[PDB]
């Protein structure tokens, strides 16, 4: 139910 | 840290958030 | 939050949630005491008897946020975590004594105006203050009743309850590293934490010099909100030898 984060903050 | 505890938005501006008072009001 | 009120702008700018990586969710509330330190619960990131044991790279940290389920871009700050620090004397066994944990952040934040540390007591700031009448300030973006979700951080300002009024409300082993809080069936109003605020802070706002402390972190309570039942708060002035120790040895 969360927005997705940006991809660089999951590297 | 020095500056702790005092919100941008409110402490720093001179501004109460709408319930602060409540807890003061508690403070007897 | 339950029985709580949408929180303003800025209000809780050290209010931080713990996030999970993989799946996103939300983890617990958490609070910034400096630009790299974050305070919380322990058992947001060690409870064996759920198999709960959260590593660094698990986890993320959002800060600045509002929205609890919102990107909010250009506004809120993740960071990643260096290290996870956990009161040697945490007891999860039996009644979560000594609640609390510490995460250091891989890179400094920056603060904003939505993005600030809240500060720590002193001796005397946690004598005048943590007397049984005396509110302080609960926020979270957990659960809106025992039994749903908020869309923004929620806010709710409750009085500190007497010790023995605590220690009869419960057949939990209380301890002098908690304390507790609410109102009480006959005081008409209402409001506690609930699952989802674990490790948020408990805040008072100190009449000497203006000024938000620390006093608690939000532990544990049986139900939510529930007459008779009150909200239990590790005592962060009591840990507090235990906080310097590590942010001096680690930091
Ligand atoms: N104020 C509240 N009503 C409230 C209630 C719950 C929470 C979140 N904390 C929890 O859910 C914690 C984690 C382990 C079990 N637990 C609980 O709160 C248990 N319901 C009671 C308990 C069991 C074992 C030891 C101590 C307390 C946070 C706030
Ligand atoms: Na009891
Ligand atoms: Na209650």
Redesign the pocket.
Known sequence: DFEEIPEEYLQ | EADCGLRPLFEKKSLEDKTERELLESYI | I?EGSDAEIGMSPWQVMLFRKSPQELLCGASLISDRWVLT?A?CLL?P??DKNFTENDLLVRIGKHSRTRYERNIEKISMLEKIYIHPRY??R???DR?IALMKLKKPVAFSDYIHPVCLPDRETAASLLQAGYKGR?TGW?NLK?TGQPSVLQVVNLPIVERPVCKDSTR?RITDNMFC??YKPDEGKRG???????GGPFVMKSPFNNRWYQMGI?????????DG?????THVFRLKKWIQKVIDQFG
């Open positions: 339950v619960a058992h409870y008897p759920w007891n999860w039996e009644n979560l609640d609960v957990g025992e939990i809080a609410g506690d934490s609930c699952e989802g605020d674990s939000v532990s544990w309570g049986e139900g939510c909100d529930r039942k009150y909200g239990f708060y």
